[PDB]
Write a protein that binds this ligand. Structure first.
Ligand SMILES: [Ca+2]
Ligand SMILES: [Ca+2]
Length: 724
């Protein structure tokens, strides 16, 4: 057919570091994510629409969005600063993407440096800003010593503001040699005082946040020609945000002892009088009582003197949200102790639309399930409705529509406002021939038995509730039997089910397991092979009540089961394929000369013993698609596929003699998702240029019950379901 694409519905699942309301047009808003692109708000549907699904495999780094700006002068314009890592993990430089149709189409201005959409400090901002009087002028705060950058042609071209005196010097984790935690977080927000410009004339007063505990805020009063450190400013902290109440003339800084978004153990809120230069400590709590940093800063644009902030890094018992209606002289908070451990809330929290946010937890007071939140760097009051606010957490977007009930001494209602955001990273996917259509393995929220692809599942896997599921499998001939492995701070790292994943019980494990690795289920459900991180390959008869070390197979090998012969298991490591014919007790080395470097994914064919498809490799070594029909003794490399990364199967086409094969691959010079109904003799692309989703290499499977349907992994855009 032509294909249509949709998410298997989950609602959220990831960190939303920034939410942006346009300051001139009611109900125009956007959200940015750290690995999953950017979204525009749909008021009529109370949902979000993805804007960057066109970002392709070779430019996957552009799915990280470190900043977004919505033009107040011309609300049709929106800009996004993109790029994911500044170390070797992201091979492409950053860019500023520009749109003049609210994100429907984009052009890219590539920068000569990398950006950090998924790096420490990504919750600070916004560091991309448009001049609110002369909207051809934009600024971008840059990391890694690149300083402050500027465009004077509406984002088409960029150069460094060499007069800016401080490129930053703060790093989260200086001992890190990987480049992930030791980067200079640089310039972290830019805020204009729109009172200091006029239509078509550059705004003269510009405020800039810098990741430097001794010099965290600078300003210009001559339109960015010269810059100076603001005298009298607080020291010892990083300003996560700088927001100006133009009605009272006060600039507010929410400060933290770290760059966030995960850490922060101390904080203040300080206030600067832009007319007199006075500084005042307006913190909601005393320095000695702040065990967290502040962020989540927002001013009510319709109510001068009203503002809010968050304890963004308060992990226990909950996050905290503060509100002042007198410019920070006095505050109240969303919840209080009323004689510890008892607590009183100014809100009710209702997650019936996203029930898994309970986390399956049953905490004692003062902790609640669900929680008010965590990692709350983003909090925004609707500039056109004092009764609405939205805030981001590490798993969702929450909001309320009766916020001013707070001031009345009443109770306001908080619900998810996240529908449409699909932000999970997918590790594995399985579609069994009976039971639910899909079992997913996900980062951060474990994964789900999806009984309905169009409905939010009630709860993630529990007993155990793993942070991330790295691998799952089902018994081909007995799909009631399922196994999953994954990551957690504590053992157990493995769970079993005999009711198709609806309910679970833990397995035991060998000592030294540090992560899930991969797991495989015997075709008859009688036993399992587990290749964990931190320990070697083990096998078990029964539901992992004890494990025995497998011989003849390298630690860390990728393991799979035959789908027909319950005694036959497979392994792959460093270019060598391994086979076991005794339930995983002993392996022998078989085919060699497979990719020695790079990711590999492989799966055996439902219905046929010893028919194996194997995809993988890398840009700098062997790369392609291989097939064996002799249980891995020999493989043939497909002449039709230049590169391939994931491979999986679904129901045969009408009249076809072989199951349908799906791959994420590069075929005939084109990266995409492809389908074959003639056992790989020919291929058809089934996605398109608008539906690419960056790195789709983790997993793919068809559906044994539905011809043409495919489930595709993404790294930040959830589970993509393609249907003809
Ligand atoms: Ca360290
Ligand atoms: Ca699997």
């Amino acid at each position: 057919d032509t294909y249509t694409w949709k998410n298997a519905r989950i609602d959220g699942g990831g960190f939303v570091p920034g939410i942006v309301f346009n300051r001139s047009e009611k109900n125009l808003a956007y959200a940015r994510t750290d690995i999953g692109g950017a979204y525009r708000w749909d008021q009529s549907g109370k949902q979000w629409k993805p804007l960057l699904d066109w970002v392709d495999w070779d430019r996957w780094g552009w799915t990280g969005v470190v900043s977004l700006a919505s033009d107040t002068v011309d609300p049709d314009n929106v800009y996004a600063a993109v790029g994911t890592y500044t170390n070797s993990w992201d091979p492409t430089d950053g860019a500023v993407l520009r749109s003049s149709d609210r994100g429907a189409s984009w052009k890219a201005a590539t920068l000569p440096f990398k950006l950090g959409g998924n790096m420490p400090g990504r919750g600070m901002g916004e560091r991309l800003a448009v001049d609110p009087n002369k909207n051809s002028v934009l600024y971008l705060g840059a990391p890694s010593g690149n300083g402050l950058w500027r465009s004077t042609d509406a984002g088409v071209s960029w150069s460094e503001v060499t007069a800016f005196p401080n490129p930053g010097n703060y790093a989260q984790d200086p001992s890190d040699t990987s480049g992930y935690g030791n980067d200079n977080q640089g310039i972290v927000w830019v805020t204009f005082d729109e009172r200091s410009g006029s239509a078509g004339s550059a705004t003269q007063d510009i405020y800039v946040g810098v990741a430097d505990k001794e010099n965290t805020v600078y300003r210009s009063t001559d339109g960015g020609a010269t810059w100076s450190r603001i005298p009298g400013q607080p020291t010892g902290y990083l300003a996560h945000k700088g927001v100006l109440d133009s009605a009272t003339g006060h600039l507010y800084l929410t400060l933290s002892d770290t760059g966030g978004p995960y850490d922060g153990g101390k904080g203040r809120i300080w206030r600067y009088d832009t007319a007199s230069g006075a500084w005042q400590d307006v913190s909601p709590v005393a320095e000695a009582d702040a065990y967290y940093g502040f962020s989540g800063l927002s001013v009510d644009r319709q109510k001068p003197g009203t503002l809010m902030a968050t304890a963004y890094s308060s992990w226990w018992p909950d996050t905290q949200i503060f509100r002042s209606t007198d410019s920070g002289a006095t505050w109240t908070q969303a919840w209080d102790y009323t004689g510890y451990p008892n607590r009183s809330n100014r809100y009710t929290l209702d997650v019936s639309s996203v029930p898994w946010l309970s986390w399956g937890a049953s905490p004692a007071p003062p902790e609640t399930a669900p929680k008010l939140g965590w990692m709350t760097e983003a909090l925004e009051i609707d500039p056109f409705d004092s009764d609405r606010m939205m805030y981001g957490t590490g798993a969702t977007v929450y909001g309320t529509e009766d916020l001013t009930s707070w001031d009345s001494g009443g109770t306001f209602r908080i619900t998810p406002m996240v529908k449409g955001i699909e932000e999970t990273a997918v590790n594995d996917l399985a579609s069994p021939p009976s039971g639910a259509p899909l079992l997913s393995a996900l980062g951060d929220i474990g994964g789900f038995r999806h009984t309905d692809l169009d409905a939010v599942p009630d709860l993630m896997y529990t007993s155990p509730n793993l942070d991330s599921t790295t691998s799952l499998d089902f018994a081909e001939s007995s799909p009631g039997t399922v196994v999953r492995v994954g990551n957690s701070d504590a053992a157990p790292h493995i769970g079993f089910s005999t009711d198709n994943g609806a309910n679970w019980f833990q397995g035991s494990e060998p000592s030294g397991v540090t992560g899930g690795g991969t797991v495989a289920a015997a075709a008859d459900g009688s036993g399992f092979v587990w290749s964990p991180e931190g320990a070697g390959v083990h096998h078990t008869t029964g539901f992992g009540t004890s494990w025995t070390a497998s011989t003849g197979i390298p630690a860390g090998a990728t393991v799979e089961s035959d789908r027909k012969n319950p005694e036959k298991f497979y392994g792959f490591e460093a270019g060598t394929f391994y086979v076991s014919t005794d339930g995983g007790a002993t392996f022998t080395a078989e085919a060699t000369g497979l990719p020695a470097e790079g990711n590999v994914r492989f799966q055996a064919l439902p219905g046929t013993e010893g028919d194996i498809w194997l995809a993988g490799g890398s840009d700098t070594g062997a790369y392609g698609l291989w097939r064996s029909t002799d249980s891995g003794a020999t493989f043939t490399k497909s002449a039709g596929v230049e590169q391939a990364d994931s491979v999986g199967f679904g129901k045969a086409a009408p009249g076809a003699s072989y199951r349908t094969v799906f791959v994420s691959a590069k075929i005939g010079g084109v990266r995409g998702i492809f389908r074959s109904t003639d056992a790989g003799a020919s291929w058809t692309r089934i996605n398109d240029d608008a539906h690419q989703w960056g790195w789709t290499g983790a997993a793919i499977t068809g559906d044994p019950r539905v011809y043409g349907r495919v489930y595709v992994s993404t790294n930040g855009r959830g589970i993509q379901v393609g249907e003809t």
